[PDB]
Amino acid sequence: GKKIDFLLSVVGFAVDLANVWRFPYLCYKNGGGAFLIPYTLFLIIAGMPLFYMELALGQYNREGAATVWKICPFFKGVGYAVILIALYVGFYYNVIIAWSLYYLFSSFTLNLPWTDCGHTWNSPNCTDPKLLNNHTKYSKYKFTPAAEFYERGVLHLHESSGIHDIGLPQWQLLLCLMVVVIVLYFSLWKGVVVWITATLPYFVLFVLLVHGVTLPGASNGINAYLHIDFYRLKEATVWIDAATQIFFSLGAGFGVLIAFASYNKFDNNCYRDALLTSSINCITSFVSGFAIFSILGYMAHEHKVNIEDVATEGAGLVFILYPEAISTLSGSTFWAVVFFVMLLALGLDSSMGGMEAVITGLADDFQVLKRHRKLFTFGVTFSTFLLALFCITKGGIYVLTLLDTFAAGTSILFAVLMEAIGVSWFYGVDRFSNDIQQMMGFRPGLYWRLCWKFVSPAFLLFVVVVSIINFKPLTYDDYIFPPWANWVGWGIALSSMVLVPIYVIYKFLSTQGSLWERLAYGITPENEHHLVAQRDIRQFQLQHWLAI
Ligand SMILES: [Cl-]
């Protein structure tokens, strides 16, 4: 009875829109398996400890992303940075849900629009494998009925020459975005059915696996998935992608975990939560990759194209793959409806989590907003609506790619690294362990403390540095962005990165007293500031810095 509720809760917590939409094309962009090795390694080493850290911080301090830094006042800039990262992601995260709503609306028919050519949106080059009996060597084969539908009857991308000619918003995606935004606002306006939003993703995935294994070309897709290329592992692109996707799927670095845990019971078991979430995430990622590559092998067989060229490597890979596998099921209309309802539910839940992450973080800092949740929610929602309108234009896919590349890459990694440093070195891993013992009754093991203090920061710093010194100019399949687009993306990435040093400078300059007094007040918890006048600061001793 109640244990069923516990199950539903944990499984729903372990699923995300990321695992269903983003992981497929990141695994396919790399070799598959070659992406799972770095994925699992980083998952354990950095993701599990930092997920546990964020949950414990939120639970113990009962604060959001920003105000939780009363323990170490100099990192409120890190809190602000994660809130800004969360605000940036929503702009394009809400457009991926409008796509799901459009596909659901298009799915209410006995002849799915992506099954064959002959529609108003099909180009003369549309090739239906059933209606007819090569393809360069390194193009992405955009002439299939499903790709044609996605890019011309939904995106209308054929009316944009690049990110310099995005055009005007598409009026159908406009209505879908309006509906999504209204639903979010009315689901968030009055405070902080989910049963069927945690079981459906696994039923869909199970059906996908079982059915796609038994397809004419799935064997070669599985063989490609299970073949590992280490010369790919020697490039750091896979490592950067794996780290970013880990922090996307687990929800760390967005302020969502801290805000959600601020409402948890003080005695809730965070260690069990972290273990279960990480295990489910790993298993789900592996199964999702398996099914995705089985479908990719099927399409490679059907279209007589190389597996590396069958589908796009960016956002929309799912909107091509999943319709193409649904069209081969019996009663495909029912399956399309079910699948796109599943996508809508998952996306709405993820957007609600992120928007709540932002609203709670900003309301804890300013009480006026906390007293006017309706108006503040409306403001956040309307800003998101406009900055997402930017992404539903004819060239909106280019803007979405730029955002999905730059709004949480080196920025989210840097923010999580700063969180770990502030919690482990300046606040004290020993103090954090004592707090965890006070909450849950047992102290964290040596592995957790080592990961929090040395291992996870080291790997995070390595990946952050490598993502900067080894930066590949942005591209969308065969399209190469103009040089200024990369500068715009890097400015977007820095807009949140610079909030940490800027706030450190501001806090230092605001505090009164001599240099040492200002430093002590900036590194001491606000509830122990009376000790500063007594010249009793742990951080000014070697024992604090040599503590694990
Ligand atoms: Cl994932």
UniProtKB/Swiss-Prot annotation:
Outcome following mutation: F248A: Loss of norepinephrine binding
Topology class, membrane: Multi-pass membrane protein
Cytoplasmic side: 58-76, 191-192, 264-269, 360-374, 424-453, 501-548
Keyword Ion transport attached: no
Processing and modification events after translation: Palmitoylated; palmitoylation regulates protein levels and neurotransmitter transport.
GO annotation terms (biological process): amino acid transport; chemical synaptic transmission; dopamine uptake involved in synaptic transmission; monoamine transport; neuron cellular homeostasis; neurotransmitter transport; norepinephrine transport; norepinephrine uptake
Residues bound to (R)-noradrenaline 2: Y28, K29, E313
Effect of K76A: Decreased homodimerization and norepinephrine transport
Entry binding sites for dopamine 2: E313
Residue positions binding Na(+) 1: G12, V15, D349, S350
Record: residues binding dopamine 1: D16, A86, F248
Outcome reported for the amino acid change (mutating D16A): Loss of norepinephrine binding. Abolishes norepinephrine uptake
Localization: Cell membrane; Cell projection, Axon; Synapse, Synaptosome
Disease listed for this protein: Orthostatic intolerance: An autosomal dominant disorder characterized by lightheadedness, palpitations, fatigue, blurred vision and tachycardia following postural change from a supine to an upright position, in the absence of hypotension. A syncope with transient cognitive impairment and dyspnea may also occur. Plasma norepinephrine concentration is abnormally high.
Protein name, entry field: Sodium-dependent noradrenaline transporter
Organism expressing this protein natively: Homo sapiens (Human)
